[PDB]
Design a protein around this nucleic acid. Structure first.
Ligand SMILES: Nc1ccn([C@H]2C[C@H](O)[C@@H](COP(=O)(O)OP(=O)(O)OP(=O)(O)O)O2)c(=O)n1
Ligand SMILES: [Ca+2]
Ligand SMILES: [Ca+2]
Ligand SMILES: [Ca+2]
Ligand SMILES: [Ca+2]
Ligand SMILES: [Ca+2]
Length: 885
DNA sequence: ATCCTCCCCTAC
DNA sequence: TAAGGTAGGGGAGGAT
């Protein structure tokens, strides 16, 4: 269809109507016409009112700025001289320095006392000039009055849009009210957007509502999900230069609605009717594309979603329209003449990997590619639409041929395309993608768009700037300087390896690293030193503390740190999510709620990580190292306290043994053969141990393993009990059977062997199954699908890896192949070459009847993991004999 | 025969 | 702030 937004009130007028809208995105821009507070640059916020009206609100009069410390010079307070310095800067920086305001601030770096210092807040008429100013102060030669020649630390480096959001109290996905009489309409001939309401307000006059109570609701966002089909060549993934887009299916709904209010398919050529959806068929591809752009503009979606839309559908359409010279195509943002462009960049982090990105500006609309969401929030063996639809939704080549048939074959194609457009919307709603990300944007204060495009650091940065503003504190700008060394981390306890046929109680600290930062008041602002404690005559333990890393931090007596408060808020949110999880029946919903609480846990742990990131801009290893140091002492103290308490000479039946533990957990063999008693002792022990640490540190009994197969550090399995009557699952940590680089032959067999032993207590049956499997490998009875190994392609290599060698080979053969950051699928083929030269594309293998290295799969894939699980039961000799041959 | 490094992924 | 942290198994090969 294409229904448009509800019409505005007929008597609408800025003097009559407040405008309250949920802002979903914002960007820096220059406003045509009069300046405000000597600047023509604005932050344009886009969003939606409770009645479903779209809004572009220009926030005017907000000048970017930087802080530098006032010079240590007698003439520093002479206004005439400050005025002259401003003239000097205007001569140097394109006449873009507005003024200098003298303010009292303190650096976030350390405790020197509560005495604040004079800083110079230097305002600019356009935001980007702050960067050049910062550079000049840092490495330029601003030699006026010998004030900064030369040179100086600068403070509060942050992008202009976020600077405004922080200073105005605006978080992501938040509500803003524009009071009647306080804003003005953009005149018809000056309009730049297609929003129903295009207005301007001075930043001081907007009301930024905290996302709480009556202002924690969300606006009725219009969600558009789409999917395209292309008719491409046999053997070639479609290329925009040659292969037509032949269908675009669309579904549009209101956030949270039961059903979409628009369902349609744009087709090239004719297409027979589809019950419950509109069909818009076109004689030419060009027409279809232009109509689709017009459709977006008229429907005015707030969020554009789909599955792989980011890396495929969107760039493909842009590139296709360009190839076809449909030159007005790429204008479907909310800014009428702002072109959608592909920005090529690179994203890299340990958590998310390293890869090229192709982000497109669709100004004033959000994007939520469900493939990108699911990849971030879930660990799955496969992320194909089919795979994830079957997994989350319970769902169960010819394309070009269907296209070249008739109205009926194209209809068939259109149902497929419509379904592919609908699934992402089902996924978004069931996985609560929009709802949970709204929460995250609000809690951390970042724009929604940062969640999928950016990392954990920017969320920490936003929270830090917001807390610092509250206490007149500013943050020094430092250059990233990656270290060649990692600081010392956690203790992993030496395992007493083997098969335990008695209950093992697992105890672990709630939110360990955050609880350590809170208990011990660990923050940039509380960091001190020997020199200060003496100049100030502070008393150990009352006024400060010395960490096991040897660092001095002041106590809450002297200063409440800010990191503890940020962590407190994140843990509160997490606790709300956990309660929701505790209160929910449906297994699937609980799953989703489990990701929500995990996401918030990672956010809290990322505040610790931020302090340890030298690949980052505010490392403080005093904090990160003190945290890990405390952690090592705590697990040692926990192990010692459990062993000293629960022993025969204290009236217990057995001497408790800590058989294993990792970072913040201990696995305890109390000695009893009874499961409930082990769980009761585990609970009592955690309660006792918790009394030995400072609030809010807390040890809890987590679960019992019975039996428990401990193979090595970070390698074990066990039946996992949270009640003594029925076990929850067969839990596996670290084993090949839970690593996504195992071939499924190994994972499946390991899984079945573990089940037969731990659940069915049938070692004989497990061994018969392994022997059968060995026979199948050696007689080529294993489907190639179970032999495929997948590994991520790294950006660069020192040592040649089989999948990386194969990726280059594939490009040589086909002109294209896996890119950095893609998983590469391969099987090992037979032959005399080095292993890294013997990884091959499974399709290439099938096509050419190439023999797979069967013995390799036996000896170098199956054999070691299987021996490691059965040897503890049948012994090393038998386990090894089973593999001859 | 030991111990190291690069690599990939997972345990925290 | 472009990009949260460290420990460590085990495959595969390198240096003494
Ligand atoms: N992604 C992660 C996971 C863990 N850790 C560190 C900090 C954690 O506090 C500690 C223990 O890991 P847990 O998985 O037990 O995490 P928590 O104790 O924080 O959370 P929970 O309350 O779920 O046990 O390891 C981390 O820095 N980053
Ligand atoms: Ca698709
Ligand atoms: Ca726990
Ligand atoms: Ca924990
Ligand atoms: Ca743990
Ligand atoms: Ca090692």
């Amino acid at each position: 269809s294409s229904f448009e937004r509800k019409k505005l009130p007929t008597d609408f007028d800025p003097s009559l109507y407040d405008i309250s809208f949920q802002q979903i995105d914002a960007e820096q821009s220059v406003l045509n016409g009069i300046k405000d507070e000597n600047t023509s640059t604005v932050v344009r916020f886009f969003g939606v009112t409770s009645e479903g009206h779209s809004v572009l609100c220009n926030v005017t009069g907000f000048k970017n700025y930087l802080y530098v410390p006032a010079p240590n010079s007698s003439d520093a307070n002479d206004q005439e001289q400050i005025n002259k310095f401003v003239h000097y800067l205007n001569e140097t920086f394109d006449h873009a320095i507005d003024s200098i305001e003298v303010v009292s601030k303190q650096s976030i770096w350390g405790y020197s006392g509560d005495t604040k210092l004079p800083f110079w807040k230097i305002y600019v008429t356009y935001p980007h000039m702050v960067n050049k100013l910062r550079t000049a102060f840092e490495r330029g030669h601003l030699s006026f009055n010998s004030w900064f020649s030369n040179g100086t630390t600068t403070y509060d480096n942050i992008a202009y849009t976020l600077r405004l959001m922080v200073d105005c109290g605006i978080v992501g996905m938040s509500w803003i009210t524009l009071p009647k009489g306080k804003y003005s309409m953009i005149e018809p001939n000056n309009r730049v957007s297609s929003c129903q309401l295009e207005v301007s307000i001075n930043y001081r006059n907007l009301i930024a509502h905290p996302a709480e109570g009556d202002w924690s609701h969300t606006a009725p966002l219009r969600i558009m999900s789409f999917d395209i089909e292309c008719a491409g060549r046999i053997g070639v993934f479609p290329e925009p230069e040659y292969d037509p887009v032949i269908q675009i299916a669309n579904v549009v709904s209101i956030a949270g609605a039961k059903k979409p209010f628009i369902r349609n398919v744009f087709t090239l050529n004719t297409c027979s009717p589809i019950t419950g959806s509109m069909i818009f068929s076109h004689a030419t591809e060009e027409e279809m594309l232009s109509n689709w752009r017009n459709f977006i503009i008229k429907v005015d979606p707030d969020v554009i979603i789909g599955y792989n839309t980011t890396n495929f559908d969107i760039p493909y359409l842009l590139n296709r329209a360009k190839a076809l010279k449909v030159n007005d195509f790429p204008y479907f943002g909310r800014l009428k003449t702002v072109k959608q462009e592909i920005k090529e960049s690179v994203f890299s982090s340990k958590a998310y990997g390293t890869r090229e990105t192709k982000n497109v500006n669709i100004d004033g609309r959000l994007q939520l590619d469900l493939l990108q969401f699911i990849q971030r929030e879930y660990k799955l063996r496969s992320y194909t639409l089919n795979a994830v639809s079957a997994h989350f939704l319970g769902e169960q080549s010819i394309i070009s041929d269907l296209q070249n048939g008739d109205s009926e074959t194209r209809r068939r194609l259109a149902v497929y395309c419509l379904k592919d457009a609908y699934l992402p919307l089902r996924l978004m709603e069931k996985l609560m993608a929009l709802v949970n990300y709204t929460e995250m944007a609000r809690v951390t204060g970042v724009p929604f768009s940062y969640l999928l495009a950016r990392g954990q650091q920017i969320k920490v940065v936003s929270q830090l700037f917001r807390k610092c503003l509250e206490i007149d504190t500013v943050i020094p700008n430092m250059q990233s300087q990656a270290s060649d060394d990692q600081y010392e981390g956690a203790t992993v306890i030496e395992p007493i390896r083997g098969y335990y046929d008695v209950p093992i109680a697992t105890l672990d600290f709630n939110s360990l690293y955050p609880s350590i930062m809170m208990a011990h008041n660990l923050c940039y602002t509380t960091l001190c030193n020997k020199a200060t404690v003496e100049r100030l005559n502070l008393k150990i333990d009352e006024d400060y503390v010395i960490t096991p890393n040897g660092d001095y931090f002041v106590t809450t007596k002297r200063r409440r740190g800010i990191l503890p408060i940020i962590l407190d808020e994140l843990i509160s949110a997490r606790k709300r999510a956990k309660k929701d999880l505790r209160d929910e029946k449906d297994p699937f919903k609980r799953d989703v709620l489990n990701g929500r609480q995990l996401a918030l846990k990672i956010s809290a742990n990322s505040v610790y990580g931020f302090t340890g990131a030298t690949v980052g801009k505010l490392p403080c290893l005093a904090i990160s190292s003190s945290v890990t140091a405390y952690g090592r002492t705590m697990i040692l103290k926990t192990k010692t306290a459990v062993q000293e308490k629960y022993c025969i000479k204290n009236g217990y039946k057995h001497d408790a043994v800590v058989v294993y533990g990792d970072t913040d957990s201990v696995m305890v063999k109390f000695g009893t053969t009874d499961l409930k008693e082990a769980m009761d002792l585990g609970t009592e022990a955690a309660k006792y141990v918790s009394t030995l640490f400072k609030h809010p540190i807390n040890l809890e009994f987590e679960k019992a393993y019975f039996p428990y197969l401990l193979i090595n550090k970070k390698r074990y399995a066990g039946l996992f009990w949270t009640n003594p009557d029925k076990f929850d699952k067969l839990d596996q940590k670290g084993l090949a059977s839970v690593r996504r680089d195992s071939c499924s032959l190994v994972s499946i067999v390991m899984n079945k062997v573990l089940k037969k032993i731990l659940i069915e207590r049938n070692v004989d049956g497990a061994l018969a199954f392994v022997r059968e499997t060995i026979n199948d490998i050696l007689h080529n009875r294993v489907d190639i699908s179970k032999l495929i190994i997948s590994k991520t392609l790294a950006p660069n290599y020192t040592n040649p890896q089989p999948h990386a060698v194969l990726a280059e080979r594939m490009k040589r053969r086909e002109g294209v192949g896996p890119n950095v950051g893609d998983r590469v699928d391969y099987v090992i083929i037979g032959g005399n070459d080095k292993l890294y030269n013997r990884a091959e594309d499974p399709l290439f293998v099938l096509e050419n009847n190439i023999q797979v290295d069967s013995r390799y799969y036996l000896t170098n894939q199956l054999q070691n993991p299987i021996i490691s699980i059965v040897a503890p039961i049948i012994g090393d000799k038998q386990a090894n004999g089973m593999f001859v041959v």
